Amino acid sequence: DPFERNKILGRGINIGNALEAPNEGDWGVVIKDEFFDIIKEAGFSHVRIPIRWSTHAYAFPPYKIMDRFFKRVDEVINGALKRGLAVVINIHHYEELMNDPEEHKERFLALWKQIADRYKDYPETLFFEILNEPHGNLTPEKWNELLEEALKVIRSIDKKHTIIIGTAEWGGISALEKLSVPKWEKNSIVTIHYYNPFEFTHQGAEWVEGSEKWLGRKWGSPDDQKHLIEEFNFIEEWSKKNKRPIYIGEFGAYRKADLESRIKWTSFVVREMEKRRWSWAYWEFCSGFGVYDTLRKTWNKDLLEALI
Numbered sequence: 001d002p003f004e005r006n007k008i009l010g011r012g013i014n015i016g017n018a019l020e021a022p023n024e025g026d027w028g029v030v031i032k033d034e035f036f037d038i039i040k041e042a043g044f045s046h047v048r049i050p051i052r053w054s055t056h057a058y059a060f061p062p063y064k065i066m067d068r069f070f071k072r073v074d075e076v077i078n079g080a081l082k083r084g085l086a087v088v089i090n091i092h093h094y095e096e097l098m099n100d101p102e103e104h105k106e107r108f109l110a111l112w113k114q115i116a117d118r119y120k121d122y123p124e125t126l127f128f129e130i131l132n133e134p135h136g137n138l139t140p141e142k143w144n145e146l147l148e149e150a151l152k153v154i155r156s157i158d159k160k161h162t163i164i165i166g167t168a169e170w171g172g173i174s175a176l177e178k179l180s181v182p183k184w185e186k187n188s189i190v191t192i193h194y195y196n197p198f199e200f201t202h203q204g205a206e207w208v209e210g211s212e213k214w215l216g217r218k219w220g221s222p223d224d225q226k227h228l229i230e231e232f233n234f235i236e237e238w239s240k241k242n243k244r245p246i247y248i249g250e251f252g253a254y255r256k257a258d259l260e261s262r263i264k265w266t267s268f269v270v271r272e273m274e275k276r277r278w279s280w281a282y283w284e285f286c287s288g289f290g291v292y293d294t295l296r297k298t299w300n301k302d303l304l305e306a307l308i
Contacts, residue, residue: 002187005162006245008125009086009189009279010045011270011308013291014250016284020050020092020132024072028287031076035285036083038292042299043308046086046125048249048281049076050132053111054094063110070118081123088164088249088281089115090129098136101146108146112153120158128154129164129191129249133171140168140178151185163188164247171250172196173231176238189279190242192235193250194269196228201265204256205288215256220264229272236276248273252283255290259302267306282307 015035021027031049039047056069073089080087091111097104112130119126130150134143147165154163163185169175171193181188195201203214239246251269253262266282273280286292291303 002162002189003245005124005127005187006189006247006277006279008045009088009127009247011043012046012048012086012088012279012281013039013044013307014048014050014281014284015286016050016289017287018050019073019076020052022052022055029285031079032294033079036080036085038297039285040083040085042304044085046088046279046281047080048088048129049080049090050092051089052093053091053115054096054107057107057111057114059107061106061110063107063114065111065114074118077119077122077126081125086125086127088127088129089119090132090164091115092132094131097131098134098138101138101142105146105149109149109153112150113157116154116157120160122161124160127162127164127189128158129166130154131166133166133193134168135170138168140175143168144178144180148182151182151188155185159187161187164191164249165189166191166193166249173235176235181242181244188244189247190239190244191247191249193283194231194248195251196231197224200257200261201253203254205254216258217261218258219253219261225268228268232272232276246276246278248278248280250281250283252289255288263302263306266303270307 015031017027018024018029018031024030057063057065077087097108130147165181165188167175167179199214200217200219202208202211203217205211253265283289286294291300
């Protein structure tokens with residue numbers, strides 16, 4: 001029952017800027033084993049672990065994932081399971097697939113065959129998220145086809161774990177109505193990344209074109225709140241119609257946004273997601289959108305309380 005699995009997922013946090021960089025640590029974070037005790041003790045039910053498998057697998061058939069990297073992923077997953085956290089793993093930043101999905105179709109499917117074979121006997125609290133933020137040449141219609149192919153590969157090996165399926169056009173609400181999850185698959189959760197208003201949450205983000213023009217944007221008025229509720233009502237109505245649970249797998253505001261607005265946006269979004277019984281994972285633990293300082297070993301108390 002994917003709705004039970006959604007409840008098991010509950011509130012989580014992303015440990016980003018870590019295994020989805022080209023090399024772990026390049027973007028500032030190495031996943032320390034103690035982070036699992038910190039996160040479980042703070043009250044989170046799961047962790048989401050972005051993983052750039054595509055740079056750790058050969059480019060020629062059978063596209064084998066490299067041994068040292070597989071062993072590292074196993075260490076992270078088992079570290080989190082040891083504390084009783086559920087775990088979401090994914091394929092993140094596979095840019096070549098987005099730019100030429102025809103060329104990379106078989107390689108993507110070989111990564112899932114290998115990941116599902118590796119983890120098929122791991123606990124039911126491990127979740128498989130097919131592909132982070134499909135976009136570009138992997139259009140909404142091509143993603144519907146590719147995600148069904150990935151479901152077939154995974155289900156040919158594992159009928160136990162819940163699979164998490166995102167939306168196209170960068171994984172937000174834009175293309176939700178275009179998403180089709182096949183009727184034959186009955187143990188999947190649909191995931192959305194919620195960063196609206198984008199101009200507020202990504203103001204000043206260095207990798208985002210023209211984001212400097214948003215610096216200083218505030219959030220917190222009654223109209224800001226109503227607008228966000230309308231979008232959440234749209235996602236909830238889609239969930240009810242399509243009978244699929246919802247996981248907001250990333251949400252957060254960048255550190256350049258003023259702190260009061262960040263607290264107000266984060267707290268409101270969590271209260272509203274919880275009223276709808278959605279699972280969710282904050283973006284992210286300890287870096288640019290972070291809520292925990294790894295040097296001082298302290299949480300931002302107001303943002304932690306916003307998350308709970």
